[model samples]
Target: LSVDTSEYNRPLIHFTPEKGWMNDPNGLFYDKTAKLWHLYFQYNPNATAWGQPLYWGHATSNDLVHWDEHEIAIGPEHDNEGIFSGSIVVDHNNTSGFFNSSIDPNQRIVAIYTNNIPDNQTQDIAFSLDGGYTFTKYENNPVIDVSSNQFRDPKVFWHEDSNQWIMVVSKSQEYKIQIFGSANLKNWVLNSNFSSGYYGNQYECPGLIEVPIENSDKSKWVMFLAINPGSPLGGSINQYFVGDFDGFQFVPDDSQTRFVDIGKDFYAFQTFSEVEHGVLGLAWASNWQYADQVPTNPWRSSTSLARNYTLRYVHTNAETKQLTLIQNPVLPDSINVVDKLKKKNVKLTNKKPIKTNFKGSTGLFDFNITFKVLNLNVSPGKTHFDILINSQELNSSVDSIKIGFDSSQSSFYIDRHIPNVEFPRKQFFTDKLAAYLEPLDYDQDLRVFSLYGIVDKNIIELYFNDGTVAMTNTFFMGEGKYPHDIQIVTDTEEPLFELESVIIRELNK
Candidate 1:
């Protein structure tokens, strides 16, 4: 995709390359000395359709919200076909020995990536002398060759407990992730593995990190794997496992369907390798189902916002506690609120549209809403309410992008089929995105809940019940299709819920 300021579909707060095809956020590392972020990705600089040969396109950010695009860092040097997904490390200790005597050890950035040439796939290495701006490939490549076609996506990290480098890579098409241990970042040895026969056909872009629980001293290991044709919403998506890793093996605590995002778009999610603060996640905000068919010009896909992840402790039984993932928008401290609108104590009966004081404009924005079920008495199937955004008018037809609860089905759904456009180019546009909202423990009335949303030029991140469930969707509407009016309505003749409060704040770029 070419850099076109005239394009309204480009995201405002999220990061996108000036031009080219991009996906599977790769080599995410934070430089402590410079206090900047190094973001490299699976990029095709020449075309917009996942075209080869691939290169590691580069970008930097002082804050995670805004990014400055740099030149392509690493590519296929000679006979190497393409540079695929991998991880980056701030090797301050110079364990790789790639830095010279004159180069500072703290500035050495080591990258371990996958090289694809014809039918063979192997692991390779590259190093940067000055932070992470540029890189040079190792003279003797293929540091670890497994002699398998389904070996890629090497996630390397410094294991302090074991005093060695740990790499967790995907064994593609086998529904397994192969683990390896290294001391010099060059040689490797095979370790234990994790195999799942459920919710996986092919696994790619694997990630592992130890995260601390909120307000507690306890921490747990979380592993992420991206799968294709197995998403709850269809096509490609990400699934995760929360378990314990003793440097060599990963063991899941339970066997339940755990997803990182409950939306249709967010896929290929990767977290930062080395950081001082919270764990940051970035994803490609387009699905393979209709990624090429989205109505954009010159460019194809954009990334999801940099979100902070937390491990929440949810009680399964009175004695057992499980760790579940929670996500929230990462807003920069310098962000200025251009406008604000607040509404409180609003009652909703049947089909009443409450407009906001703010109008729709072309920029970043966020919506925070708190509501409670006012009454539980309703007809069997009509016990639900509709919350619409970027919508022009209010109607009962499923013809626009909106979100609501279905009490009869005990679920929440985001309807993107409203006013569906006939895409003659692909049949993947008919996929419906929905997720089950865990039932509340309230007895007489439904407990108070909240919906948090972050909106960019072409994406919407909606979290329900305090981020317990999230739905991230990508949309492209023509010039007048941006939904500025926000409203809440219900199908039943009686009231279902009360809008306790709502706030809208525009994010200034």
Candidate 2:
């Protein structure tokens, strides 16, 4: 399904070049001197209907939008195994073996990725010496190994204080991801294991980043975790907790954990280093539940738009019952294509569906939606509302909202008809994107609420009310569909459903 690359919004940023399958942020590191952003991704190049080898694809961007696709950086070379996810770093000291023969500054990009072995298990190591273009396995492969096979997705970062490196890997059955420390980037030693105990059934991609909260507040640490094991408060999806890291362990500051995003279009997060912006992250944008059906015009899958997140405390005053996560989805202003609302503000019948149409392409976008609940009737089908795309209108009387990909048409949809339903809306995803649903308070109908979501060809993440709730569904869109159309709907009418405003902008072009 990997097809001709396609752009989502404007300035030609954020895209799903290949279809059918994509996951994780790989070899994401900024080159300060060249002002270049080198990104490696896990891609499967098979046709839309089949699963292929995990190929390490490379792309670069100057401003994080216009990407230059390079040759295959890494593949199933020696072992013929899938190339799993990992991180990249500028190893100036040549400690990772790949740079020992060269002193050139450009030769410092050392990629440490997870190597798929046999079974449902994995290992880790550095790549060959030909810069990041190739990888040479570490002499002491899998620097660290655990008993459980839930070990994969290694995130590496240098520690100045310890003068070494630290990593975090998953252990799903035990419901914990252990952190390890290493001096030479090899011979890793167990530092500690942490978890909230059987929340999601699997803790796949773990990100441990230390960024400033609000202004210069250095009293806390941002420990973002992407989990899929425990029963989700909203729906099965990705979430992060804001806590304090005393250089050793993470301590959650919130009485109840704080979630970064409430939408469902994100997962398998990997930390990316931007010298100017400090550290940022990008995540796979679809879920496993319906990943097989994501529409793949050319590309297979995509990550959510690259997010530059800053930690800020969301005050949950005595009157506020829900814990709110504070994050500003950064959108570069370079992209000129902006969404002009055909009809800015409108109120429609709750039972009857309504629609909002717009002209735009498919790719990563920064969008904002405002919903003010006028009323919630107790009638069986008169209390819910939805904002739909590619459909006739918004349906405001249903009890639930479902956004899904229809492979038959290679498109995606947002549906709010009855209790159990879904619709298609997009064709593919490759770059990253984020969605926000805000200031939501739900009554008896937990599933009948406004939502936000991102879709690649095979993945979709929906965030409801600022990520207070979400549903991550893996959908596979069929071949031959180009991403087009935008719609909204609702199922309520007594007080009527109104859309205050909606905005869309492209990112990482």
Candidate 3:
């Protein structure tokens, strides 16, 4: 049976809007005063790949859509050097002793960053007084210069216990983050060091976040680190350690129960502007490990689908429980479009192999769907008992998202039925989708299905009745862009799985 489908009308957020070289989430800040999201990123506009004309490219969005690109925020234009990754903070009172009269009356955003100096690593400060629309490099630069080239990716956060500001910078050579403190946001003094282990490698882009325990008697805090050279996957990703911070180094409580990102391409992540939405974080979808080698798409790399994360408590086996991260897309609440039709809790028992052409109805918009299956018995060789297949060759952009089950391996993929590349020999990340559904105990509750997609952009994020297993990817059919048909597969004649109910809804304002 046909499930509800929501169409996305905004521009497909692929790579950074620019067509040149971009990587890592640089200067990601949410400005509260402007009520806008001010994002400054590492960009090299001239090079096809990388020649290092590093600059902070600026853009702002109110709803994470309709982004308005601004002029280059800061760069190596004057008595300058290359700019690197850093964080932007609002100096409510300039308590850091760094802000001065040179700052505009309206400008008050302070940035703690690293500048690429020859043969060594150095840190500096930049300020934006005009509500974060623009920034000025501090004249008293290199506040924290080190002889070691490994010092970079400075993340500064204010500490409530000490009434001071804390700095966390990666000592890549030591596989740890060097901790420092500042009474005012300017001058810093080394306090202590926290080494992850004797892994004997470097850790880059490490971020520290403090999370509270929900409904618990004890006060708990966790620190997040984006481990680059050292990752469990032998690739780069963001990881975290649950611990307590005493305005100095973080003291981890337990080592083994820590967690990392949910997907493969998550990296360079940081907490969003301190807000009530709990926390908003950004990550680079493309990685450095295979970046240069991989074939490029027209839009080479994109940030992982942005997620709003919250802390959740759950019970595990043997009387053990823990706090974990859960997330979902930050889609707007008001999605007003024309309504075509609405069906409530319709069962799909007799519609096993439902097929239809939707191209004739509303050309393209947003939709929501819920599907239920019953009497499922997965085939022995495969992982799942049933699967839903959507082929782009037969439909439009959403056609490629599919789900199937084999006994030991159930897979959900967006197959580029006609696989090809953007450049001559490159293959971008638009192929293969399968979640092992680890911790199988959670599968019993996956009844309702939620799928939101935009046919025009070929972007898709699949959410299960539960939030545990979400599969996201992109597909491109430059030729077969839009065809209107869907095949909801259940091996009724084959006797593998059975469909029960599939409800479709229209969220028209």
TM-score against native, each model: 0.92, 0.71, 0.78
Cα RMSD, each candidate: 3.1, 7.8, 6.1
Q: Flag the better candidate by TM-score, 2 or 3.
A: 3
Candidate 3: tens digits of C-alpha lDDT, residues 1-509: 13212232112443354455566766666666567776767766765354465777777777654467778887864333468888877666667555577654224688877787667678888877576667777787778986877789888877778888888888877777878899866689998887763232467776766664446545445566666654544456666666788887788876653434434456677766545445677676654555544333333445555566656554333265566555556657544343333444443332435454343423233334444433455455432332333434433244443544332343334444434425332333435545533232332754323433332234444543234344443343334333233444543344333233333322222
Compose the digit string of candidate 2's lDDT tens values, residues 389-440.
3311234321223453221222234432232233343222212223333235
Give candidate 1's TM-score: 0.92
Kindly indicate the candidate among 1 and 3 with the higher lDDT.
1
Best by lDDT: 1
Off by over 4 Å in 3: 1-15, 77-81, 97-107, 197-201, 212-219, 229-234, 257-259, 289-299, 315-320, 334-351, 354-357, 360-378, 381-418, 422-466, 469-487, 492-509
Question: Model 2's lDDT to the true fold?
Answer: 0.54
Highest TM-score scorer: 1
Give one clash count per candidate, in the order shown: 7, 92, 24
Instruction: State the displacement of the C-alpha of residue 400, model 1, in Å, after optimal TM-score superposition.
Output: 4.1
The superposed Cα distance between candidate 2 and the true structure at residue 215, in angstroms, equals 3.9
- Which has the better lDDT: candidate 2, or candidate 3? 3
Q: Candidate 2: list runs displaced more than 4 Å.
A: 1-20, 47-53, 77-80, 93-107, 119-122, 127-131, 146-148, 228-236, 254-260, 295-299, 315-324, 342-386, 391-509
Residue 294, candidate 1: Cα error in Å is 1.3
